[PDB]
Design a protein around this ligand. Structure first.
Ligand SMILES: [Mg+2]
Ligand SMILES: [Mg+2]
Ligand SMILES: [Mg+2]
Lengths: 96, 224, 225, 56, 98, 291, 228
């Protein structure tokens, strides 16, 4: 089972809302190369290659583990969409 | 051909260990894990209560006036006593317990003996009431494996009760073999061994002793 | 691993002191699991003879050949003096470690039954309610692993002599052949129409068939459980 | 070309599937559990390996 | 045997005789008439389903054959008997979920 | 030159070459359809100064998941007692043979309707085995019998056990065949062969055999009081044997039905069925992936 | 009360069969010792095997040869059964040459002798040659361990060579026997008998020895712990 899935289902009024939050967050991490993560270095999900341990590349795994920390905010009408996009570009520039 | 495997240890104090050996050539997971398990459960030297005498108790299924437990329960608590011999010379002690009045007898209340350590002194043995008296002598032997009381049947006096002898310091062994790959070697084994002991011997010590017993037995294929 | 042995050698003897029972067992007169009464206790030799302080001790005894998983015994588990088999203790431990909650695990299982389809489905459901889907998924994988392991070495197999034909069968056929003749006579003398004779033969054989089903299963239950 | 396929490509593939799921489906698909998501484990061999408890 | 025979899954001797030549490819038999009959053997031919049709000789030079005796095994034929698989040693028991 | 290594002078793969997915079986070139190169192509050509050729590669290649050894080529070209449909100048056919070993996912069956896919191929040291060290070949689950009610396969196995040790085969005609008593006689003879061999070679009954006889006595399968040999023989006449687990050396806790069975490999081979796609051809009208 | 070194007994028949008794052993050590050795014996003992075959005028396995009764698939099946002993421990590979003709039943005896190489089953039937049949072979024999299918190793010394499935193990069969025994006043002690059947390439006792050695070396691997 996904780690913490029972708590994740506990956080939302509809299971489909968790999937929307998780997917939008995953897209946000991919867009900004994970620089906007709320995880601390020791909380970062890892993947064991042959060379050694590196960052887990899967942004959905990241997003779920972030949701479980209480450090994300979700809901409807938090902020206009263009203001949010522009502020995230400001704080965490996208690769060119 | 395969590179010597890496041996990985993970311990929690003196009571529990997990041990990991990977990579192994196909099949060697159970080839190593089954003998070592058999040995860890049968041939690691330890100690056990083999006999009990209690003043004014005839047989095992008796009750004790003024003590809350029956004799069965005191013997069960004695089977849980973890005693460690400090001197390889020593082979058997007799530990003595006298107490009375309202009090809860622990394992600490046994009169100490030379080169005899008691790893679990807070272990409950019995509760006594007003006018309750507990006079007992318990025989503690060195040995291996598990011997039912009837098997050894030892008796210093007529009303001494033979006790199932839980010699084994190892309480439980579990192992698992998992497929693993080294590049495009595809059916290699990863052995994970889990060892529970009472604390007198550590898991790691118990394992080193089991591998040593096995190696030693392998030297017997030498001189016809 | 959760069925228990029921034996016939002892056959319900009375004993005064437990040592009389253990001696009778030593002589080969009372089976380890036969129901006896020691001072009207309604116990068995195994429960008196083997008295384990904890699950680890009982399973160590099993590893050494002292008792089998289906032998009924006494074990001290969670401050209780249980009369149960080491296999049912092992099953309790499987649940307990899968779900990492010894108290809830103890509330969840039915300890004094052999585990089968319905009791295992109830366990999965109660676990879902009380512990969530993550722990229930780990419980399910543990049950799978241990069931597969134990079924391998159990000795389950199928030979032609395992389809045991019970004795009663022959009697129930002879009886039937009798009643048929009876019915045939009643038709000869016009007492039954053709349709009635047909319906009665069919009723006879429906009932005989149910009777032999009961006899097959009763034979298994009493002599080859 | 199959004889052009190296070894570190299988390692690269393993990083590609990390935490990802595939959908398994058995027809006829009579209720929603005829489709279920699984984390794939790469195997030699040409058969799909299915977990016992989802067969029913 | 009758299934192998009626389906032409084997070559049989046409009359009594003696085997003159034996090959992976062909069998030559000398019959009682004195005539020398040659039997080409179909080797690694492709069936409609891609399974292999090949005939293998089951006689040797000089062997005496009566009418109807086996000269060659076809596919799924072992000494003229229908051979649709293997005889294996079997245990009937569960095995670890596999 | 590596791609053409096994192509003959005329561009047909040679007899005996091993061909794998991707390899060319028949080289073929086709003239290109009249196309003005996209400006990016014009510039890339200028950068490398290479004339785009006039024909393109349209060769026959070994498809995914296929291959083997080339064993025949047929070459029919026009102008040669050969005439093809209008406009074709030549046809080439290449025959490729594979030896197919049993593998995981192949289908096995017996004549009584027991069928199954191979899920696991175990090394020999993991196989259940007889006291004399002989491992078994295949492990069939008993759960396949009760609801299927095809007990012929059990009797077959019993008689197979007899035949195994007597070196004999049987004809048991349908509804007119071997009955249980005759099979029991044959199992008694086979037992004498299987066990008297041991008793001569200087060995007695194993401790593990004694543990299994103890369990067998509790299961009702053997008469209490008889000797190890007599009880082993009772089991053998029920078609059962003591069996050792190759992983542990410990016996299976009950005696197991063991014997010879006739098993076929069916023409449902996973080699032919496995298939995957990322992208590929689409349909003309619907623009949906082809089937 | 701690039992000490038991007696080791060896009975051998030829180079093919051996019995190895160890007694007395502490209860349960018959299995603890017999079964790991059975697993190693059956899976890990180095041996020799035909790995490749060149036949003149033959392009691939799916062939016949004029004047030869067997097709090539059957001839390779016959060669899979060749047992070849290398007397020089350094030797990794040998090419046996066979040149036969006329009417004859070619056996393994018919290969050309080679220094420090012994055929253990010279009566092995290889092929039936007819009047006019000719057979000219080069068979490559290698040292190896375990089972290596032709598909896996791909060994061809020349262009038209046929790779052969290699089962290197020289061990044909292993049983062991645990019997009741006693020493003085001890009961339920084990008497262990390993029964080892080989092909003669390597004797039963040599197999037992390198099996013991393989196990010992694996026990070495617990020597240098690491923290998780
Ligand atoms: Mg493996
Ligand atoms: Mg007792
Ligand atoms: Mg409960």
């Amino acid at each position: 089972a996904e780690p913490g899935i029972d708590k994740l289902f506990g956080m939302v009024d509809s299971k489909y809302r968790l999937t929307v939050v998780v997917a939008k967050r995953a897209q946000q991490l991919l867009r900004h190369g994970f620089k906007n993560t709320v995880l601390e270095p020791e909380e970062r999900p890892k993947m064991q290659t042959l060379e050694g341990l590196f960052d887990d590349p899967n942004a959905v795994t990241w997003a779920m583990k972030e949701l479980l920390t209480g450090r994300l905010v979700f809901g409807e009408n938090l902020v206009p969409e263009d203001r949010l996009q522009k502020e995230m570009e400001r704080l965490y520039p996208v690769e060119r | 051909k395969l590179k010597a495997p890496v041996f990985t240890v993970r311990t929690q104090g003196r009571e529990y260990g997990e041990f990991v050996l990977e990579p192994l050539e196909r099949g060697f997971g159970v080839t190593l894990g089954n003998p070592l398990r058999r040995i860890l459960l049968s041939s690691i030297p330890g100690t056990a209560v083999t006999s009990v005498y209690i003043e004014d108790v005839l047989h095992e299924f008796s009750t004790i006036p003024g003590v809350k437990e029956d004799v069965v329960e005191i013997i069960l608590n004695l089977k849980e006593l973890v005693v460690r011999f400090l001197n390889p010379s020593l082979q058997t002690v007799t530990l003595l317990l006298k107490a009375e009045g309202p009090k809860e007898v622990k394992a600490r209340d046994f009169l100490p003996v030379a080169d005899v350590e008691i790893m679990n002194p807070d272990l409950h043995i019995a509760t006594l009431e007003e006018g309750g008296r507990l006079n007992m002598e318990v025989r503690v032997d060195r040995g291996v494996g598990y011997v039912p009381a009837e098997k050894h049947g030892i008796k210093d006096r007529i009303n001494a009760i033979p006790v199932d002898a839980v010699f084994s310091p190892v309480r439980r062994v579990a192992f698992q073999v998992e497929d693993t790959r080294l590049g495009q070697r595809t059916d290699l084994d990863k052995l994970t061994l889990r060892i529970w002991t009472d604390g007198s011997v550590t898991p790691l010590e118990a394992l080193n002793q089991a591998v040593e017993i096995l190696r030693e037995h392998l030297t017997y294929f030498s001189n016809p | 691993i959760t069925q228990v042995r029921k034996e016939k050698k002892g056959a319900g003897l009375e004993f005064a002191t437990p040592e009389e029972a253990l001696a009778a067992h030593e002589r080969g007169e009372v089976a380890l699991n036969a129901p006896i009464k020691v001072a009207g206790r309604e116990t068995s030799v195994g429960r008196l003879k083997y008295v384990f302080a904890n699950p680890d001790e009982a399973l160590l005894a099993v590893a050494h050949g002292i008792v089998d998983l289906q032998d009924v015994v006494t074990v001290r588990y969670m401050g209780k003096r249980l009369e149960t088999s080491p296999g049912r203790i092992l099953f309790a431990r499987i649940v307990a470690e899968a779900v990492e909650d010894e108290k809830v695990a103890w509330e969840l299982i039915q300890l004094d039954v052999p585990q089968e389809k319905n009791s295992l489905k109830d366990l999965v459901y109660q676990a879902f309610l009380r512990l969530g889907m993550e722990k229930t998924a780990r419980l399910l994988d543990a049950l799978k692993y241990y069931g597969f392991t134990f079924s391998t070495t159990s000795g389950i197999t199928i030979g032609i002599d395992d389809a045991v034909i019970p004795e009663e069968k022959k009697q129930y056929l002879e009886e039937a052949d009798r009643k048929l003749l009876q019915i045939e006579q009643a038709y000869e003398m016009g007492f039954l129409t053709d349709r009635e004779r047909y319906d009665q033969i069919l009723q006879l054989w429906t009932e005989t068939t149910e009777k032999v089903t009961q006899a097959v299963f009763k034979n298994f239950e009493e002599n080859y459980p | 070309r199959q004889r052009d396929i190296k070894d570190e490509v299988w390692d690269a593939l393993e990083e590609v599937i990390h935490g990802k799921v595939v959908l398994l489906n058995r027809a006829p698909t009579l209720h929603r559990l005829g489709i279920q998501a699984f984390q794939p484990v790469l195997v030699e061999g040409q058969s799909i390996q299915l977990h016992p408890l989802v067969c029913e | 045997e009758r299934v192998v025979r009626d389906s032409l899954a084997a070559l049989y001797a046409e009359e009594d005789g003696e085997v003159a030549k034996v090959d992976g490819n062909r069998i030559v038999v000398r019959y009682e008439d004195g005539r020398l009959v040659e039997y080409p053997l179909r080797r690694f031919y492709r069936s409609n389903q891609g399974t292999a049709l090949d005939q293998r000789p089951r006689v040797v030079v000089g062997q005496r054959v009566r009418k109807g005796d086996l000269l060659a095994d076809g596919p799924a034929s072992e000494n003229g008997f229908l051979a649709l698989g293997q005889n294996v040693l079997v245990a009937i028991m569960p095995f670890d979920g596999y | 030159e590596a791609a053409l290594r096994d192509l003959d002078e005329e561009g047909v793969v040679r007899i005996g070459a091993e061909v794998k997915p991707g390899d060319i079986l028949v080289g073929r070139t086709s003239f290109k359809g009249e196309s003005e190169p996209t400006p990016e192509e014009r510039l890339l050509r200028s950068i490398f100064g290479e004339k785009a050729r006039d024909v393109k590669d349209t060769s026959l290649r070994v498809p995914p998941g296929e291959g083997g050894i080339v064993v025949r080529t047929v070459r029919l070209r026009r102008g040669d007692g050969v005439e093809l449909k209008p406009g074709v100048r030549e046809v080439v056919r290449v025959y490729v043979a594979q030896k197919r070993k049993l593998q995981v996912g192949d289908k096995l069956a017996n004549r009584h309707g027991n069928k199954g896919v191979v899920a696991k191929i175990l090394p020999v040291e993991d196989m259940p085995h007889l006291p004399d060290g002989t491992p078994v070949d295949v492990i069939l689950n008993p759960l396949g019998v009760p609801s299927r009610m095809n007990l012929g396969q059990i009797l077959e196995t019993h008689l197979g056990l007899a035949g195994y040790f007597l070196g004999q085969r049987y004809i048991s005609p349908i509804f007119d065949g071997a009955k249980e008593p005759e099979i029991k006689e044959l199992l008694a003879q086979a037992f004498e062969v299987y066990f008297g061999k041991r008793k001569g070679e200087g060995f007695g009954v194993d401790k593990r055999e004694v543990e299994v006889l103890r369990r067998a006595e509790k299961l009702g399968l053997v008469t209490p009081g008889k000797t190890p040999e007599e009880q082993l023989k009772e089991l053998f006449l029920q078609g059962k044997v003591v069996l050792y687990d190759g992983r542990t050396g410990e016996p299976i806790e009950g005696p197991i039905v063991v014997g010879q069975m006739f098993i076929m490999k069916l023409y449902h081979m996973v080699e032919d069925k496995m298939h995957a796609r990322s992208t590929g051809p689409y349909s003309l009208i619907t623009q949906q992936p082809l089937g």
